[PDB]
Structure formats: C-alpha cells, structure tokens
C-alpha cells in the first residue's frame, strides 16, 4: 500500500484517484491518500471548485518512486513532486497516516474495474506520449492538443499519440486505393501492429490511455484518438481473433465506467453506429453492443 501525501490543501478542489473522487474544502486539514493497492499505473487529478476550467492531473507508477503533492500559489495548481529521500518519505508517511489526516483508497475486493481499464496502460509508454523526461510522472490536462491536431502549437506540451489518418499515404497503398480505404486491414496489421506498435498489447495500451484521458480530463484530442483506434479495428476485415475478443471486454468496461450524463460529449454517434451495426466486426462486439444498447440507446 503506497501513499500520496499532500503538503496542504489551500484551495477547494475535487480530487480524483483512479476512478474515484472526493471533495476537499479550502484550507481543510487534508494531507493525502493512503492505502493505494500498488499498481502498475495510477492517476491523481484535480478540478478546482472556484474554476472548473482546466482539469489536470498526473499519471504515476508507485513502484517508480515516492510521490507527493504540493500546491504552488504562484502557478496556482497542485503539483506532483518526487521525494528521492526514502527515509524522509517513510518518516512522513508512517506518521501523518497515524494522525488520522488523510483518506483511504477505498477499493472493494470484488472490484477489478481500475485494472480492467488500465490492463494495457504502462508508464513507460505514457512517458513516450507525454514527453517530460526529467520527471517519472506525467502531467495531462483538459487543454493539451495532440501532435495530430497540431498538424491541422507548443510541442513540449503536446500529447504524442500515434497519428492515425484514414486518408493519408500511410494508410493507403498506391494501387490499392479502394481496397485499403474500404478494408483497413493493411493499415491495422502491417503498418500499425507490425510496424509501429509491435504488438496488440501496446495498441490496446494507447487506446486505454486515450479513453481515460478523455474521461478524466475531458481532453478532446484524446477522445478523437480513442475513437480512431476503435474504428481502425472495426473497419478491418482481417483482425487476429485474440484482439477481437479482447476488444469487446476493453470497450465494455469503458462504457460501463462512463458517467451517464457525459454521453453527449464523450461518444461519437458515427463511430459507434458504424462499429456496432455496419462494420466488418459488428458481430464481434457482443457485450459492448449489449451494454451500449441497454445504457445509451439514444446515441444509436
């Protein structure tokens, strides 16, 4: 069980940790989050009570170091920092918990949700998409644009998602124009899986990361990337069978976790109708189809 201590909570804020969230008042005696089921990945995020503009947060692996949050009154945000002095960190963490000043990571045992959502999400791949090498954790916010968006204006603050463009030379072999546009299998299997991602686990990892960035930060370019990586699979007539079956499970948990009142802004009507009802893989997403109909029939 790792711990995220907070120096102070000077401004009223909604704090998320993985899929959970709680509120903290202005200058409330709040010193952090304890009892965090160590992971392979985690996310702590913020939305200030007095300005719900800019949600922002930090992806982090508890096993990569000891991390804490310190509010910065000049930049006006809660900043993640690393404590290289383990003894000092133990000293704070074995004490403030003893006081009663933090809240417990409230995991239910039956609840495998967070890891069904993050199964293929890794920090080393996260740090390639979010380029800030001097830190072991990765900052994302509501407003960050993707490299792809930027090509259609500060590269340091960009989300370096893999560029997917169905009307590009990368996606379309000369001489196979119609074939490759109607059946994206070449682009999925040779270009993306063999050439760029190397395996379907890395592909699914970026898909999951994009979904979570869209849901937790309302990051629009992340939602675009999520939908594109789904559409590429569904619009391919040839997809390894293990990928198809796993895709239904990945999407199901994402739809399951989506806030019910956020469906107008996190779901693209066109992409989902195509994948569930028209595409090559329409009959390969049985459980996602079943949850999407019973939960969001208005989109379709």
């Amino acid at each position: 069980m790792n711990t995220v201590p907070f120096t102070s909570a000077p401004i009223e804020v909604t704090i998320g940790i993985d899929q959970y969230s709680f509120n903290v008042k202005e200058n409330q005696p709040f010193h952090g989050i304890k009892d965090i089921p160590i992971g392979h990945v985690h996310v702590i995020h913020f939305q200030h009570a007095d300005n719900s503009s800019m949600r922002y947060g930090y992806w982090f692996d508890c096993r990569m170091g000891n991390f804490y949050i310190q509010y910065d009154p000049k930049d006006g945000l809660y900043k993640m920092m690393e404590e290289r002095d383990g003894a000092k960190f133990e000293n704070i963490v074995h004490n403030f918990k003893e006081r009663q000043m933090m809240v417990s990571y409230p995991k239910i045992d039956e609840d495998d949700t967070w890891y069904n959502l993050t199964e293929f999400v890794q920090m080393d791949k996260i740090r390639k998409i979010v380029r800030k090498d001097e830190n072991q954790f990765s900052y994302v916010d509501s407003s960050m644009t993707t490299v792809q968006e930027n090509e259609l204006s500060d590269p340091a603050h960009s989300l370096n998602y893999t560029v997917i463009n169905f009307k590009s030379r990368e996606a379309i072999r000369p001489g196979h124009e119609m074939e490759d546009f109607l059946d994206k299998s070449y682009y999925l299997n040779t270009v993306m899986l063999q050439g760029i991602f190397k395996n379907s686990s890395n592909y699914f990892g970026e898909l999951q990361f994009a979904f979570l960035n869209a849901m937790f930060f309302g990051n629009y370019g992340s939602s675009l990337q999520w939908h594109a990586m789904i559409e590429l699979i569904c619009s391919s007539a040839t997809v390894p069978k293990h990928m198809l079956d796993k895709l239904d499970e990945i999407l199901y948990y994402q739809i399951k976790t989506l806030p019910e009142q956020y469906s107008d802004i996190l779901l693209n009507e066109r992409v989902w109708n195509i994948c569930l009802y028209s595409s090559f893989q329409k009959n390969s997403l049985h459980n996602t189809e079943k949850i999407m109909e019973n939960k969001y029939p208005e989109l379709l």
Binding site: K167, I172, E177, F181
Partner: protein
C-alpha cells in the same frame, strides 16, 4: 469549402479548376428476363471533366468491359471515376494541373481525395450549385463517340465551340448550363429549338449551331421559356 453563388464569379478567375461529374459513368438498360425477373445490361459511359474558364472538356469514355466480373458497380464507379481523374491530373504538365477539383456529387469526395493523395495542394470540394452535366449525353456528338467506343478512350472537346472569341467565360458557362438544363428538362423540345432552322449549321469541329449574337439571344429566351413552361406543368402553376 463548398461552392455556390456567393463566389460564382471565382469559377472564372485564374486558378485552374475542373468540374467532375460522374452521373454517366455507370449506365444501364433495364429489361425483363425469360424467367420473369428484371436484368440490367451496361452500356458505355463517360466521365465529364470540364474547365469552366476555357471550355476544355476531358471526356473519358468508360467501356462496358471495365465492369466485367465486378460487384457493387455503383460503388466501383465512384472509385473508377476517381482513378481516371487522378490519372488525368498526373498526365498534365504541372502548370496545367488544377488547383481545385469540384465534384458535382458529394459521394465522389472520399474516392477522389484518396486517389489524389499525391497532390496535397489540390483542393477537392463539393458544390451547392445544381448543375445539369448529367444531360451531357443529350449532346449528339458526345453521345455518338461514347456509344461507338470499343475500348477505353479519352476524347477532348471545347464545349464552348468558338464562343470565347465573342463572350466571356462567365457568359459561356451560363449559356452552357442553360442549354443543358433545357436538355435535361425537355430534351426533344430543346433539340428542336436548336435544330429548327436547317440553314444554321453545326461546324464539323463544333457541338452547337453557328448562331449569330442576336440568334443566341433568341435561342436563350426560348430555352428559358421551355424551362419555365415545364416548371408550371409539373407544379400546376
């Protein structure tokens, strides 16, 4: 963006542009089979690609053999149109290649954009203009060369004949669209208007009769009258 009539004069500025109409690419005759069913037979078609400033028409004849053994022909026809337009562009010297291609049917946008990936600076656009280029096969000499073809073939025409010696490109396009709209609306009567006087002839190297300026005025008013008359008949006005 899409085209229309706010920016209708732009069609005649000095950026080269081409209209592409695909409505006569896949053409069939519908008939009844021995077992009672209904069956289609394809006949030759054509892609209509027009420079509206110069009148240059690149009429690519689509021979029926290109459909042999293919399925989903109405979809394939969009992709075949796109393939031939891209081939045409590639065969033109750089200074003759269009800066814009305007498709008369929005279903052509994706096929053409995909075939035009090598030309990122060529804009592919739809239009909100309703254009009557589907009636191109009412022009006798165009119909004849399409129906007589035994192999894929490109034929070049100036669809304005010699009009640009005397009028502007804007005026010539308006005359062309008026003529074709009349032929689309009431073809037999439109042809009669044009051919009513045998002393006015079509030159071997032209598509339309050699009217004088004053005769074109009269012809244009008879075509307007034809289109208006048919509107009233259709809607009981």
């Amino acid at each position: 963006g899409a085209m229309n009539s706010s920016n209708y004069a732009e069609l005649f500025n000095n950026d080269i542009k081409l209209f592409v109409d695909d409505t006569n690419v896949y053409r069939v005759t519908v008939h009844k089979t021995f077992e009672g069913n209904v069956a289609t037979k394809a006949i030759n078609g054509c892609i209509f690609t027009l420079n509206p400033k110069t009148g240059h028409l690149f009429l690519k004849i689509i021979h029926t053999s290109v459909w042999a053994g293919q399925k989903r022909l109405s979809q394939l026809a969009k992709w075949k149109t796109a393939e031939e337009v891209s081939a045409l562009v590639r065969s033109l010297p750089k200074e003759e290649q269009p800066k814009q291609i305007i498709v008369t049917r929005k279903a052509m946008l994706d096929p053409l954009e995909v075939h035009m990936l090598d030309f990122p600076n060529i804009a592919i656009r739809p239009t909100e203009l309703r254009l009557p280029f589907s009636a191109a096969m009412s022009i006798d000499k165009l119909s004849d060369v399409v129906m007589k073809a035994t192999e894929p073939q490109m034929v070049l025409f100036n669809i304005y004949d010699d009009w640009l010696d005397r009028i502007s490109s804007y005026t010539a396009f308006s005359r062309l669209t008026l003529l074709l709209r009349a032929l689309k609306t009431n073809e037999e009567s439109a042809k009669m208007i044009l051919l009513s006087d045998p002393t006015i002839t079509i030159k071997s190297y032209h598509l339309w009769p050699s009217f004088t300026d004053e005769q074109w005025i009269t012809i244009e008013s008879q075509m307007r009258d034809l289109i208006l008359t048919e509107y009233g008949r259709k809607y009981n006005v």
